[PDB]
Design a binder for these strands. Structure first.
Ligand SMILES: [Mg+2]
Lengths: 116, 111, 100, 53, 143
RNA sequence: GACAAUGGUAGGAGAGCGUUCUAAGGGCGUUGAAGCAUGAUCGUAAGGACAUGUGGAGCGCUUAGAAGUGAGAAUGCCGGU
RNA sequence: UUAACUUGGGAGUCAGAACAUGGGUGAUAAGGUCCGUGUUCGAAAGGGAAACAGCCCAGACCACCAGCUAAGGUCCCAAAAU
RNA sequence: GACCGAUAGUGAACCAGUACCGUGAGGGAAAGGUGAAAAGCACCCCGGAAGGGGAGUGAAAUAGAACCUGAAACCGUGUGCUUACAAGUAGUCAGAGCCCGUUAAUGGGUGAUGGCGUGCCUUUUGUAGAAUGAACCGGCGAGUUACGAUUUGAUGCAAGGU
């Protein structure tokens, strides 16, 4: 029996265009142009879940380095002592202590100089 | 309370109409009759003859006065073409698209 | 005050009356959980400060356990016929902090 | 020489910013009480009023 | 989750004036291009304007070691054909010492939508006075 | 519950969604079907529902059968712009 | 430590490229051309070499705003020792 | 009739080998649908007329002979956020400020500023390639059946099977 091409070329070419709303100009209207931007906007996102984890570490190290220099110590002298003086567990997301409570961040700097 | 009078499939183009309909939008209805009677284009008496039907269907059969009326929206959509050809040189032929237009004038009275 | 807990291979700065993403634990809803491993507990005046300090435990109370938003994972390569397409919902656990 | 690309709908609508007509520059014909185009006579009853035509 | 993002009404930016006498040219312009980007402070984030306004006085007494006074040249072009123009760092100290430091610093600033706004927190003066006494600066002992 | 594996074009092997039609068992439909339109929903993928609007008489589900069985490109072919 | 031979079902391929190292031909010429052994690209993403299939470190099951390291790096652009 | 349902099945569901092309033999398309019943819009009003808007027939004219449902491309009119010192394969991930309020879930629209980022196929030792192809949207458009051959999976019997 003749299988007529039914309502599957409606629906398959909506659920790509509806993913692609918010794009400039013709990249949200036409099929072929908004198709091949959806294939690249799920490829850019795949290397940006892997890059997000290592570019928020190029920021936490920047804040700690701009915290120990006012106590007159390097950064590389700060994550040396806190592995060697204490067994203060390696954490750099918890440079939130240096922002919030400067009185709390001062006693760590005391303990780092104490056994180095 | 608001009226309208739609004229459709007028022989004139759809881009040469909406230069004149751009000019009278949001203006008092007493002026806009007498702006279309001073411009020297080709679609001024055509638009004028349909503005004077939204100003007679707003006084008759709704019974509102024609001293307070204001043009709320006036827009020109597109009607079907008439594809005729033109015999061009070296045995070729090019297609000439005579387009037609729909004209809609809607007056209001601020209520 | 505040304290630093260690839950899912990573560390969370938490104070009081606070709700959190934590990756999946083994409790039903309406239960009570206990973090026996705290690191730097104390605000301005309260201090201990220690390598994996002992004695202080932090409680919690589970509000719901569910799944995050679907993160569609696509990857193609040009000039070839290669593609892949997946989808993922990382399961979490929402808590509420009752005592330090 | 032919176009190299299809000119878009952003570049098309920008080019006809300056493509329009201007207002006629009307007056009020003070004897009949109509509108007329200035420095012209009236198409109805109407004087020129510096010339009474 | 628990991270901080300092924004348009969560920071202040106070003033610094730096005596630029008796010290070399590119050893000075690193403790200025880091003050303008704001790496002396915690609550440093990208994508906003932290930092401090920096004023430079005594531009006339910066230094050079070796023959940079005669063999460092500043090529610029003018987009007409045959238009390259040369100027040396010995005649630039004497003629226009306000430009010499101001391009020793703006070569060290980032991608140039925000690095145009960071560079314009810098005031370079030739003598020993400055009309910015109404803004209350202080001396900054740079290393 | 331990310890293991999992980049991949030509190509070999496996496992599935969907479309029209027929047979059998059950079922919704003018107190509104198919189709179309909008939506912040569900599954590991193709794909499945449901909620108001338009629409005006026929359509899905479970097991098995049979194919004119799936379109982004062929200076592809007819129609529209 | 974990492959290897045997019998049968189904295709693909027969245009190869740089670098390293033994030699021919050319001029101890070419990103030249023709053979032996090894690697990478072919069919391989990622960090480095400013940009750059073939050079150096290393083989992506998906998620995380945790951790320790390789080639290479620590004034500033640009993470880390003026 | 496990055959087609208006680009299908005859070239042809419409008065088809007909408009139309050729001196001639010969080549050859395009077309379908109001409603259950024409009850197919009396009369007033702007108009030279077309075409409208009321009143009326009808279950509905937002089914009026451009007559069932009415997709996309493409042209319009309105409005919440936004843009006139900036070098853009137009996205992505981090994110202030503003206007909202869904299938209720660690929500939606918009995007000042920062990081990374040279379209898709086809042929290649190798393409962002300034090598090939497509203006865009919609339909149609390619490993099939027969009678044999051989191996594999099933099943019925088995010195006998058919
Ligand atoms: Mg080009």
């Amino acid at each position: 029996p003749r299988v007529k091409g039914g309502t599957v070329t409606r629906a398959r070419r909506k659920k790509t265009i509806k993913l692609a709303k918010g794009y400039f100009g013709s990249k949200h209207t036409l099929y072929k142009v908004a198709k091949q931007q959806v294939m690249k906007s799920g490829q850019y996102a795949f290397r940006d879940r892997r890059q997000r984890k290592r570019d928020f570490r190029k920021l936490w190290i920047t804040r700690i380095n701009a915290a120990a220099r006012q106590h007159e110590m390097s950064y590389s002298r700060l994550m040396n002592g806190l592995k060697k003086a204490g067994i203060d567990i390696n954490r750099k997301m918890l440079s939130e202590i240096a922002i919030s409570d400067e009185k709390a961040f001062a006693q760590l700097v005391t303990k780092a100089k104490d056994a180095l | 309370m608001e009226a309208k009078a739609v004229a459709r499939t007028i022989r004139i183009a759809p881009r040469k109409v909406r230069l004149v309909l751009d000019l009278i939008r949001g203006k008092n209805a007493a002026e806009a009759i007498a702006i279309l009677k001073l411009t020297n284009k080709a679609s001024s008496p055509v638009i004028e003859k349909v503005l004077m039907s939204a100003l007679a269907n707003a006084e008759h059969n709704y019974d509102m006065n024609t001293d307070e009326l204001v043009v709320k929206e006036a827009y020109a959509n597109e009607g079907p073409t008439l594809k005729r050809f033109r015999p061009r040189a070296q045995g070729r032929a090019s297609a000439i698209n005579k387009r037609t237009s729909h004209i809609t004038i809607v007056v209001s009275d601020g209520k | 005050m505040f304290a630093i807990i260690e839950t899912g291979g990573k560390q969370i700065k938490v104070e009081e009356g606070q709700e959190i993403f934590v990756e999946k634990l083994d409790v039903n809803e309406g239960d009570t959980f206990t973090f026996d491993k705290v690191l730097f507990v104390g605000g301005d005046s309260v201090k201990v400060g220690a390598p994996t300090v002992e004695g202080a435990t932090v409680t919690a109370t589970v509000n719901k356990q569910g799944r995050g938003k679907k993160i569609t994972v696509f990857t193609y390569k040009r000039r070839k016929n290669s593609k892949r397409k997946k989808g993922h919902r990382q399961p979490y656990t929402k808590l509420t902090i009752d005592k330090i | 020489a032919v176009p190299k690309r299809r000119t878009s709908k952003t570049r098309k609508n920008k080019r006809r910013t300056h493509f329009k007509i201007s207002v006629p520059g009307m007056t009020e014909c003070p004897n009949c009480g109509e509108y007329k185009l200035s420095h012209r006579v009236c198409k109805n009853c109407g004087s020129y009023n510096g010339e009474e035509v | 989750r628990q991270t901080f993002m300092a924004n348009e009404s969560n920071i202040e930016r106070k003033w610094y004036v730096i005596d630029a006498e008796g010290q070399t040219l590119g050893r000075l312009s690193s403790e200025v291009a880091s003050i303008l980007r704001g790496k002396n402070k915690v609550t440093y984030t990208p994508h906003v304007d932290t930092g401090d306004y920096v004023i430079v006085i005594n531009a006339s007494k910066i230094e050079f070691t070796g023959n940079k006074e005669t063999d460092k040249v500043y090529y610029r072009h003018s987009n007409h054909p045959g238009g390259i123009k040369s100027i040396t760092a010995g005649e630039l100290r004497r003629t226009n010492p306000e430009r010499l430091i101001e391009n020793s610093i703006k070569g060290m600033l980032p991608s140039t939508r925000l690095g145009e706004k960071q560079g314009k927190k810098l005031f370079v003066y030739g003598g020993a006075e400055h009309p910015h006494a109404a803004q209350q600066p202080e001396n900054y002992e740079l290393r």
